[PDB]
Amino acid sequence: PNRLIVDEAINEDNSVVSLSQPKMDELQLFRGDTVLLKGKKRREAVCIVLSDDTCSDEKIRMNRVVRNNLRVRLGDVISIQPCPDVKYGKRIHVLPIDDTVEGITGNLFEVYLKPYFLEAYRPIRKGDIFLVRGGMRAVEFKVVETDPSPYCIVAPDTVIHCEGEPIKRE
Amino acid sequence: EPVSKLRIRTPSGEFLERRFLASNKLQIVFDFVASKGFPWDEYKLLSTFPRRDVTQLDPNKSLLEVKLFPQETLFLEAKE
């Protein structure tokens, strides 16, 4: 794997990390490739790489959500490498984070998860925390488990389970 | 000159892969996936970030016009 400096996101999507096309050619990454990222404390993330218009090839752009799953801040180092073997998910288990759901009343699957994953073929990893925009709300969800494990792509047939009680803030 | 490479993921997981001259119309791409077992009326071709139903774009536009160049990963999904 190659080591890159973390920089702010251009694409604000949770599943995206961007690189300059020169860097992508160099690492032999193809637009829409799934990549495995490693940050601090043994933390890992699966994202989709996309081309970026910036100049510096020595930096990777990602949003706060990916930075937190990786336990890294702006300016830190992470490694990125191809992760070609990502399989469509049979089933995933995700639960909302308590503090983020306390005034929310709607159906979480219909309002948040369904529209979030719909035909976006997002890669997710067990342990990920992801933020989903719904109505006038943003709700955080934690990936409790996936099958295959520890990561998969949420495909149209991937069963999405969120049955259970909100996880507590650590 | 302009060549666009497309990686297309089938519902089973496997990737179809193919290079096209970017000047080629989208209908050439539609024909290629149909050349496999994924005809236009049974399956849609999706791009992501942003989400687009590629099979619902103007078949007479080139890859270049619809910006499917130089690289792109697409997904085949049964129409239902």
Resolution (A): 2.2
Q: Centre a 10 Å sphere on the Cβ of residue B58 and count the other Cβ atoms it contains.
A: 11
CB contact under 8 A, B73 and A31: yes
Experimental method: X-ray
Q: Cα(A131)–Cα(A140) distance, rounded to whole angstroms?
A: 4
Tell whether A30 lies on the interface with B, counting CB pairs under 8 A.
yes
Of A160, A87, A79, nearest to A118 (Cα)? A160
Q: Which of A36, A52, A85 is the last residue in one of the domains?
A: A85
Say which CATH architecture domain B1-80 belongs to.
Roll (3.10)
CB contact under 8 A, A32 and B73: yes
Residue with tokens 């992801």: A130
Contact B31, B24 (CB under 8 A): no
In the numeric block, which tokens belong to residue A74?
A: 């702006």
In the numeric block, which tokens belong to residue B38?
A: 């994924």
CB contact under 8 A, B7 and A121: no
Residue B11 preceded by cis peptide, ω within 30: no
Q: Are residues A120 and A135 in the same domain?
A: yes
Domain of A39, in residue numbers: 1-85
Edge-first strand order for the sheet with A91-96 is A129-133, A138-147, A91-96, A159-161
Q: Are residues A144 and A80 in the same domain?
A: no
Helix (H) or strand (E) holding B2: none
Q: Centre a 10 Å sphere on the Cβ of residue B11 and count the other Cβ atoms it contains.
A: 15
Nearby residues of B27 by Cβ (< 8 Å), 6 or more positions away: B59, B60
Nearest CB among A15, A87, A121 relative to B75 is that of A121
**Residues in chain B within 8 Å Cβ distance of A32:** 7, 48, 71-74
DSSP B29: H
CB contact under 8 A, A48 and B75: no
Helix H, strand E, coil C: the string for chain A is: CEEEEEECCCCCCCCEEEEEHHHHHHHCCCCCCEEEEECCCCCEEEEEEEEECCCCCCEEEECHHHHHHCCCCCCCEEEEEECCCCCECCEEEEEEEHHHHCCCCCCHHHHHHHHHHCCCCEEEECCCEEEEECCCCEEEEEEEEEECCCEEEECCCCEEECCCCCECCC
Tell whether A10 lies on the interface with B, counting CB pairs under 8 A.
no
CB contact under 8 A, B48 and A32: yes
Q: What is the largest CA-CA distance in chain A?
A: 48
Q: Which of A43, A64, A85 is the last residue in one of the domains?
A: A85
Contact B24, B30 (CB under 8 A): no
CATH number at residue A71: 2.40.40.20
Of A62, A124, A116, A61, nearest to A88 (Cα)? A124
Half-sphere exposure of B45 (CA within 13 A, CB side): 26
Q: Which of A31, A55, A85 is the last residue in one of the domains?
A: A85
Q: Are residues A45 and A99 in the same domain?
A: no
Nearest CB among A16, A33, A88 relative to B13 is that of A88
**Residues in chain B within 8 Å Cβ distance of A88:** 11, 13
Structural domains of chain A, count: 2
**Residues in chain B within 8 Å Cβ distance of A30:** 5, 7, 71, 73
